């Protein structure tokens, strides 16, 4: 039950449990739950120090930390016992040299679709992507579609979310570009055919959740997040170099956290603008943010003062 103003130090009824919550997507969620105030039980894998910038979000006794491996059952059956909602965003990029990567999107969202489901939770939420299609792409992009399909068997009403591609503040998607101060700028693959996707702004995706977390009546009704205005061009890569003007890893360096001479060069250019009958963002209101307002901020190289911004795009066509 709620009480008083929801500024800080209130009760607000909900008791979430947000798995992951260290990466760019999982962290920025917990910031908006350390405002309205709630028992946001965040468990973390193996990181004592790398989670320290998360503590001045929970007021005093709001958040709480636990350690958990993920494959073992009861390590994820001990935190899910006292909860109201539980959302999932676990996962990564490329296959690691210890794990198997196949069932990690199958058994592990099912390992927390175990007695977690039975114990009395509600509003269990998973994530998707706008390009995860069971047609022959990719090793990561499909086998996420296994997680769309093989985990849908349990919890027949979830509101699994299907956000668009994200541009943000500390992300990897747009930041994979303009970090290519290198012996050449090679696009994918010297072509501007299907560029670009829908770069939704990360504040909207973390505002969609917290409007769905007490919506009500949003269970089973999966959602797909609208992007900015409107499609975009290959001019994006030219626009990135327009204004730019050309955790827990190791002690010295981690010798393998690469740029992946594999599927990753084409894990983003397979676009597949999916079904526009999905409800999917504006009805999960209210949020609609462009790119050309929030583009100055995260792009940051050695000029640092002089921008003189005028670069834009028409729509582009098929708008």
């Amino acid at each position: 039950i709620p009480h008083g103003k929801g500024g800080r130090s209130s009760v607000s009824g909900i008791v979430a449990t947000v798995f992951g919550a260290t990466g760019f997507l999982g962290r920025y969620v917990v910031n908006h739950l350390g405002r309205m105030g709630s028992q946001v039980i965040v468990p973390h894998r193996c990181e004592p120090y790398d989670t320290m910038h998360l503590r001045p979000m929970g007021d005093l006794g709001q958040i709480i930390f636990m350690d958990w491996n993920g494959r073992d059952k009861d390590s994820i059956r001990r935190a899910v016992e006292h909860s109201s909602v539980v959302i999932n965003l676990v996962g990564r990029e490329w296959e690691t040299q210890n794990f198997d990567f196949e069932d990690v999107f199958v058994k592990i969202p099912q390992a927390i679709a175990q007695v977690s489901k039975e114990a009395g939770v509600e509003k269990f939420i998973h994530i998707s992507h706008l390009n995860a299609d069971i047609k022959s792409s990719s090793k990561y992009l499909r086998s996420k579609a296994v997680g769309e399909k093989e985990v849908r068997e349990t919890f027949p009403e979830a509101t699994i979310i299907k956000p668009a591609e994200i541009f943000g503040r500390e992300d990897r998607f747009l930041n994979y570009f303009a970090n290519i101060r290198w012996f050449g700028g090679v696009p994918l693959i010297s072509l501007g055919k299907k560029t670009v996707k829908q770069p939704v702004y990360i504040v909207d995706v973390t505002k969609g959740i917290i409007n769905a977390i007490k919506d009500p009546d949003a269970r089973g009704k999966t959602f797909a997040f609208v992007g900015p205005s409107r499609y975009l061009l290959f001019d994006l890569v030219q626009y990135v170099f327009a204004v730019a003007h050309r955790i827990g890893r190791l002690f010295e360096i981690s010798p393998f956290e690469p740029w992946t001479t594999r599927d990753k060069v084409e894990r983003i250019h397979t676009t597949d603008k999916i079904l526009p009958h999905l409800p999917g963002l504006e009805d999960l209101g209210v949020e609609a943010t462009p790119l050309e307002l929030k583009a100055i901020e995260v792009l940051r190289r050695h000029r640092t003062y002089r921008w003189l911004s005028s670069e834009i795009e028409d729509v582009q066509p098929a708008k």
Binding site: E170, I247, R249, E252, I253, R300, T304
Partner: protein
Amino acid sequence: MNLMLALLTNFTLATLLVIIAFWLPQLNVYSEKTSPYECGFDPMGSARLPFSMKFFLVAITFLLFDLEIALLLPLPWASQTANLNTMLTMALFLIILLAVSLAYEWTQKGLE
């Protein structure tokens, strides 16, 4: 032929240790907030570098006292010599010729 391999050892050991500190163990692609910070423990300095007169005369004055020590430099080689009344009375000239250049400037230095 080691003079010249007496120093190219010393500089390739020098440039070795800097790139195994500036490069290698470094690469800060994580959070690495290089935002507007790093401004040398301050903020934005909208002023440029202003001229300071009392810190220009210190440059020129040294340069004109630096020349005639190189004239004064071959005094130990001017010992094992011929006619030495010339050698003594000319060696005393340059020092006084350096000394007067003090005393004229010494009546106006400024807060140096």
